[PDB]
Amino acid sequence: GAKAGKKVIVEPHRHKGVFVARGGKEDLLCTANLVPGESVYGEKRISVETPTKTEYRIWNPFRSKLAAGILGGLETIYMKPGSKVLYLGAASGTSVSHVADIVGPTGAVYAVEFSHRSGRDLINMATRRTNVIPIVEDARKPMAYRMLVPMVDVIFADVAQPDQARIVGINARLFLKQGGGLLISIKASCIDSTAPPEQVFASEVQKLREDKFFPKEQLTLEPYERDHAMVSCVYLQKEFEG
Amino acid sequence: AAWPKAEDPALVQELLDCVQQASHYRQLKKGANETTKSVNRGTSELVILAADTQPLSIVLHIPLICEEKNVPYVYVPSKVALGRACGVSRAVIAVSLTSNEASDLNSKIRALRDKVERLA
Amino acid sequence: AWVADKARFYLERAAPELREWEEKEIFTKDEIRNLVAKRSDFEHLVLAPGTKPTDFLNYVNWERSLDRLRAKRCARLNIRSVTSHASQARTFGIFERAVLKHPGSIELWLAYLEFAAQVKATKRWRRIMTRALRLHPMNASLWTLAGRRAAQNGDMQRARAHFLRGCRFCTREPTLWLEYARCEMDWLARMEAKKPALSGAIPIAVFDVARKQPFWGPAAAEKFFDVFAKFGHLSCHERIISHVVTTMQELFPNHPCTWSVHIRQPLVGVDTPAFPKALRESLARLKAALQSTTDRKALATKMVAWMDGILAIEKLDAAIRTVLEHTKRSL
Amino acid sequence: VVNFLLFESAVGFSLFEVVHQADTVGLELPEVKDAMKTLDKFGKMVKLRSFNPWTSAAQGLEAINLISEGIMPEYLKSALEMNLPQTSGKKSKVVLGVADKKLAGEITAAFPGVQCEAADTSEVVAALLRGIRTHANKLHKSLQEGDIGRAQLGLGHAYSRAKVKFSVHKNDNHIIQGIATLDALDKSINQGAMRVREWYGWHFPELIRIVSDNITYAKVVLAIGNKSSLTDESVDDLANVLNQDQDKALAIIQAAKVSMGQDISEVDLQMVRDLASNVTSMADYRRILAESLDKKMSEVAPNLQVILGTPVAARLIAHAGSLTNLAKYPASTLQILPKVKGRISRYLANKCSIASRIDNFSEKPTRHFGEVLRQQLEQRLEWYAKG
Amino acid sequence: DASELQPITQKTSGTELEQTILAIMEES
């Protein structure tokens, strides 16, 4: 496989903040480590001694739906370095560390988790990274963290709820800028377990359009997860920033 | 400690009947380490955990990985009943029953995880 | 920046006063060209994007000095037709867009209140004070200014309104509480000198509510006593002082501040044969306090500070003075 | 028709006064959306009327834990008493705009003359508070001491930790970094002792042949002075260094009498005794770390401590990364971190997973379940001998 | 009119201070 000690070279991706480290027989995806010299959940990481403090961390697509979508080929992921990201469904903070490593020190990641022990893991990794704040609250009630979340630019939504579109609709009505980017990860077996997945995805896209989003891209991230889709949409506009 | 606890009125026995059906269909992993490895390999569709366990920290460590991977989990109140339903001749405290692309068990799986998602 | 088109209005408003000053013999034409150029530079600095409260205050000071200069020149040239009302109106306009642009600057708010109080504008002063208190509610200086000027006017109900909202807000520091007790006892002294109030129970109530505040220290209660000990010529002053001492004795028994109020209690309204009698009583209390089991360095620093306050007065005997020095030096 | 509006943020709560209120029929219009975007056309709508900051982070924590639960705080009631015109709603009311419906009901119940409009119900006040949340950095910057980012960061951490009770059962960082220190300075103790052993056996070469236990070597080269000034049982030291009268000190002194190494200088002896003082200070710190780390391990994870032993148990904790990761791993992953040896290894991995999850997921853990599992491992150690 | 800060009554009294001060001035 991609064994420890192999030499890889690290080139930039098409997206900002993401890199692709290619070498030998396996090309993998990575992000620049915010706190160098320590892994979060025991991942392989990439050390380069520049002509020390520079380390990159490998982004598992089978573990995180954002890296699955990036390897599927989204047109954009909306999170440049220095952009505020509201993460909904921040279960234990595995992919939230990579989103925080994307947005860098001058950005901010507001990671909302509902369960408490996942909240403990999230508060530990947000003790390590000083740009992710942890919010242990229910994402169905965004009146709880309206003191904490300012108007963010991107929303990531990886909640597996049947009322997912309403949750994202009220969270984006409260905390998203005009023309706000978001990526929602739809799991068809949790939305509607009886209906076919393409019909489930079209119904969820139509519900987002009723909840005032304008959808611009959609990919079924198929070689990494079954019956999952990632829908990219812009809030209240057609272009992303302005 | 076990907040998605299953209640009495014909949900525990629906769970254990679906468990026995999947154990006949050979689509079921038994014991805490096998449930953990199945959830971490992502093939799991639902996971049943006993609540009568001597100290409960085992079936407390499994819900963290289940919440991280977003699969449904539910507590049945008897590990002896869970082992009898699986067909083990030992008491089983954790049961994870996986996904396959073509079966008729998956309808029971889907209705069961809809009831479990309503329970949470 | 539409600043040229924005300042055109203020210059066109200030023009007819300059026409009146030119048609009188008060300012000559070259001086009026200088006034035009200086007001134009000031307006284009004031209405700029990146501005400052010191810039607004420089413009206010220039317009106010121009009003004073024209007043001197008008009295010298013996004209009574020219009035200062247009200059006061434009100075109020400068101050209103100043507090619009920078509302978080208490130096500019206090300069606005000083100007409105100086040109006899009491109702306007009260409105400016209300806006300043709404923007800076944690400012004990603004709250005491409001309450003390309402007490100086004599509307004691309005002074109590400002002071009770101020003590509702400013609860971190004791300062506004001490000033409210000072104002209430000054009202009590005014009610005495005009000759309920006969009991004078309001500073005792202030103390009883102040007992549970986040600043409630023995040093804070000593500050309460150091406020109360002034103007002892009253009726219930011994009642108030004795209640403060028994409160501090029942709550902080062996603190050096409580031993200090045990020292300095019986010298309330003394200036005179009752002066050294109570001094001998207090020095007996002080000697018992120095020998007693208390932090002697802290109590000695308190007593040498109070003894500097003692040594600040003349008209005493030299034996008493040298025994204060002898008891001072070994501390 | 709105008159004032509340707006609560992490630095404090400020209430704005609207002038030239928003059009309610054309709220979904592109020109009005562009007006709500641009600050130059929304600051005409809002004018900052009052600001109340917190006194401390404790007051901010109490503020969130009242406001999110719904109940209004006494200082919010204070600032509303100060800023709103005192009325009762019989002939004239004041419309306030608030973000939450329960807070709306409570402000209306505390002040009968103030009709509150919630942002969850009314789209006008929703769009208006949305614009204020958009431009909230610039509307406050004349009195915004510092920033809002670190305030929101620290306040979200304080709120989440008060909701979770994080610090009362998160304790493993001391253990894992103490293991890192213990290994690093054990290596440094051995390296400095090897260095002082070579650089003092250059002067007196009999001490390496006659004395092992390099910490005691550092102690005897701290106390020995030079080669010339030896006497056996002078004062306070050698009797509790080792055997005193008939065993060791005579042998060191006859080694000094037959000794042939190079004569050392005073400043070089000063530097060698400084290095030995350094090494023995690090050894004393190692024994202090071992005692304190045994006590901390018995406070945190006593079952793993009794089934494994505290050094190897805390090594396993540090290599897993945390107790939560150690508990989330199954038993085969804990194996990753003949036949009878592998069988006992698998059994030990199973019982160590059970001990890790028991010691982790307790609030303040116990001792007797680890005692039971250690007795089970002992009776299995007795069980494999019969065969 | 929210021009000035009106004197407090028993309706707009918040804290124990304002309650006790208004009680004393009512007994006056």
Place this chain on the structure above:
Amino acid sequence: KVDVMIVHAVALLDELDKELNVMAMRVKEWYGWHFPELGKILPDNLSYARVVLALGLRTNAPNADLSEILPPEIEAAVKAAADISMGTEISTEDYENIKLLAVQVVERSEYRRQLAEYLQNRMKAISPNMTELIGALVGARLIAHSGSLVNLAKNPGSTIQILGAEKALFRALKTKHATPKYGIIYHASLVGQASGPNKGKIARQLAAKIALSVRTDAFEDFPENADDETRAAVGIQARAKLENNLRLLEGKPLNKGVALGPNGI
């Protein structure tokens, strides 16, 4: 005088610098759980350990005394950040371990400082000429790489110029690249004042004078009632001449040009 103490003391100094850096980074991560903004305020790790010592927990911050280790305009922000920070509360029973590791790293720093003073005194004892030329630390580095004093003295000046840069040297010599201009000599005092190509010129001249001074300090005899001011005579003369050559090389003027008027005439 024997130089095995020189090579052992400078290897010990390098290892002490490494271990002190890693223990100081460890006490930074070890106290950053209780007070994280202090690591951003104080970037110097010795003063960080001193503040961890003197300042207790964050609760003891208005009653602390800190002006003895670092002056104010630096350490009023530490009291402000101790009031406004967001680190979690730790018990005093763990602050004993944190304060005691700060004790350890401060003691390691004091020992390293007295080891540097000892290295300076022993270098002025062994080789006064070279110590008068470049100084005790760079002299000890040269003695360390060559092995001994009489082993450094057998080297040409071109060797002493590029001691320590040997990897780049032999890489360049085997691949026909351009060799490095200097080695250990770069971190001396007298080559650090130059700038541009005068740096390499002063490195050549300084390496030649170092070769002469090391040969003098390793082979010349003295009547043993010889003062140090006359034992370091070659070093004094070479340093004065070499500073004169450095200031000539730095005061070389720039090229003249045609001064043109506004027309171009």
